[PDB]
Structure 1
């Protein structure tokens, strides 16, 4: 501080709105990747090409991904994903949502991410919230 304290604050890397609900009838976790807001601008007044990867840890299965939305810092994804996992095995896992900037010719930069531990989720009601993207 003062600079040290400022440096510790959460950087403005945008926010993601998502929903989550466990379907006890079909025994699957339903995830809605709704929209992102205020993604950071690129240099020289440019915008990113955001998409979201959605997956469970420690599961090593291939991560799900939304479609890529071109040149926008405020994408509306409106996509749903399903994870076939019996409830009893869900409490030890962690749902990860990570927003990337698509590029055809170079490694895709990560914009930010956040994690939702299953043991923190309120099972029985649909979850819906905005989460600030965390650095790496």
Structure 2
């Protein structure tokens, strides 16, 4: 309900690197005072959360246009089992920056060869049980 996100995706086989372009976003819900939020998008490889990339902060727009580009130096063999994460954040100067949305893209569903560029609907980020342990016994 927050809005949609237009992004670009393609792989450069000449340098063996992933080219992820953040085009823009639309119809984002307002969380700030003026009637518009201060959005910025954090993008990182889904498999390992290392070297996350963040865009510049746009002031008071529910339709921010970033038109930025990020490069992930990752071989083509490892790429197949690697996912992409694009999460939209709301900037606040005096508090925690609340997450507006998030989107995950499996690299096995992605088809490289033609330059990909699409709009995808944003969804609410997941907050499961922490322990994840189990005990087995018998009763008689």
Do they superpose with TM above 0.5?
yes
User: Alpha-carbon deviation of 1:128?
Assistant: 0.6
Partner SS, residue 89 of structure 1: helix
- Shift, 1:57, TM fit: 2.0
Using the alignment, how far apart are the partners of 1:87 and 1:28 within structure 2? 8
Give the aligned CA root-mean-square deviation in angstroms.
1.2
Contact (CA 8 Å) 2:17, 2:73: kept in 1 or not?
yes
Cα distance, 1:37 vs structure 2:
0.4
Task: Verify: 1:39 aligned to 2:28, yes or no.
Answer: yes
Specify which structure has the higher proportion of helix.
Answer: 1
- Tell me the secondary structure at the aligned position of residue 7 of structure 2: strand
SS in 1 for 2:124: coil
Which has a greater percent of strand? 1
Gaps of 5+ in 2: 126-140
- Answering whether residue 3 of structure 2 is matched by residue 14 of structure 1, we say yes
Which range is displaced more, 77-86 or 51-60? 51-60
Q: CA deviation at 1:45?
A: 5.5
Instruction: Provide runs of 4+ in structure 1 moved above 6 Å.
Output: none
The alignment's TM-score, normalised by the length of structure 1, stands at 0.88
Q: Is the 8 A contact 2:29 2:62 kept in 1?
A: yes
Number of aligned positions between the proteins: 125
Aligned-partner Cα distance in 2 for 1:53–1:86: 22
